[PDB]
Amino acid sequence: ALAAPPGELTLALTPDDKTLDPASLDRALAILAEHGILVLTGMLRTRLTDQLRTAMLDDLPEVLRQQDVPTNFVPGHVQQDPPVRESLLFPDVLLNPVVYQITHAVLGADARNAVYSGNMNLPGSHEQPVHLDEPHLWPGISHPPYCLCVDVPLIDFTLENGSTEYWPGSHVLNPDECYDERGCVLPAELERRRAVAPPVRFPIPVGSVVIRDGRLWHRGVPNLSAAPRPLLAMTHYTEWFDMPPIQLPDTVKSWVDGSDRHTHAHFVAGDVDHLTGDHPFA
Numbered sequence: 001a002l003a004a005p006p007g008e009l010t011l012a013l014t015p016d017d018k019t020l021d022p023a024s025l026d027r028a029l030a031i032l033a034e035h036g037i038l039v040l041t042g043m044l045r046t047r048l049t050d051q052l053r054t055a056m057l058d059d060l061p062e063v064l065r066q067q068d069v070p071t072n073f074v075p076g077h078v079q080q081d082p083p084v085r086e087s088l089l090f091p092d093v094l095l096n097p098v099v100y101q102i103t104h105a106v107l108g109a110d111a112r113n114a115v116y117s118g119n120m121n122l123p124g125s126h127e128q129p130v131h132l133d134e135p136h137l138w139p140g141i142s143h144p145p146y147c148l149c150v151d152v153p154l155i156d157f158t159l160e161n162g163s164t165e166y167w168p169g170s171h172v173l174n175p176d177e178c179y180d181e182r183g184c185v186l187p188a189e190l191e192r193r194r195a196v197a198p199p200v201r202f203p204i205p206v207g208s209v210v211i212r213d214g215r216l217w218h219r220g221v222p223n224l225s226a227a228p229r230p231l232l233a234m235t236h237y238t239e240w241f242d243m244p245p246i247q248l249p250d251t252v253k254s255w256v257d258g259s260d261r262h263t264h265a266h267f268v269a270g271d272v273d274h275l276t277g278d279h280p281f282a
């Protein structure tokens with residue numbers, strides 16, 4: 001019911017900021033440890049978010065033409081990969097120096113991005129169940145994080161247009177028989193948790209970047225606006241967690257492969273089909 005992101009969760013920047021001073025970084029880490037979600041305002045320029053927003057709304061028709069449209073949990077929550085064309089792969093988005101500074105500190109210098117995907121929340125979408133995007137490695141065990149979701153809204157997220165319900169501090173909870181095979185939280189454990197630390201939902205301005213634990217409870221909620229709500233989604237993992245590589249064109253290999261901000265990527269000659277992944281050599 002907030003009119004902006006809570007201060008407990010938020011850290012304000014300009015796009016020119018390339019690192020956090022030690023005091024800011026310790027705070028960012030302290031938030032991800034305690035709350036499991038960190039909102040970074042003013043990270044990305046309009047020039048980038050605009051091109052990416054345009055590119056994904058242009059692709060949405062090709063996505064909805066598909067015989068079976070891939071959704072997450074309920075109708076209206078479409079899985080859509082953004083394009084991997086030389087011209088729409090920006091270093092400030094894939095290899096953001098502030099994001100990787102936080103993820104290196106949390107997951108290790110060998111941590112790597114292994115997801116370049118998206119969530120198109122359509123008008124009249126349904127309520128998702130509360131869930132983990134990425135599960136705990138064993139039931140009934142406390143362990144540190146092995147993955148951080150990096151969510152990039154491509155329009156102003158509002159209460160009406162489907163800003164995500166987040167459950168702060170839920171990333172460290174992992175009792176027995178808590179999660180089912182799709183990673184949905186059992187209803188008993190929700191109501192116990194709602195009493196101690198209830199969910200929050202808030203606007204997130206475009207140009208913001210949200211970093212959160214992969215294990216954080218959350219649910220997508222109905223888009224009641226007249227416009228699709230695109231989200232570009234990356235996920236950094238520890239070196240040792242097994243993931244299939246991101247299909248990228250060799251036209252970007254030059255700067256992506258060199259970097260000490262690691263991507264788990266496989267480079268193909270020529271164009272890559274993000275949408276349906278039909279490209280001949282995977």
Ligand SMILES: NC[C@H]1O[C@H](O[C@H]2[C@H](O)[C@@H](O)[C@H](N)C[C@@H]2N)[C@H](N)[C@@H](O)[C@@H]1O
Nearest residue numbers: 072079115117118119133149233234235
């Ligand atoms: N790293 C965050 C993302 O993780 C999940 O999606 C993955 C999901 O983990 C896989 O089952 C699927 N094969 C790919 C999909 N993109 C979530 N369902 C997405 O909503 C979220 O964008």
Ligand code: NI
Nearest residue numbers: 131132133218
């Ligand atoms: Ni989710």
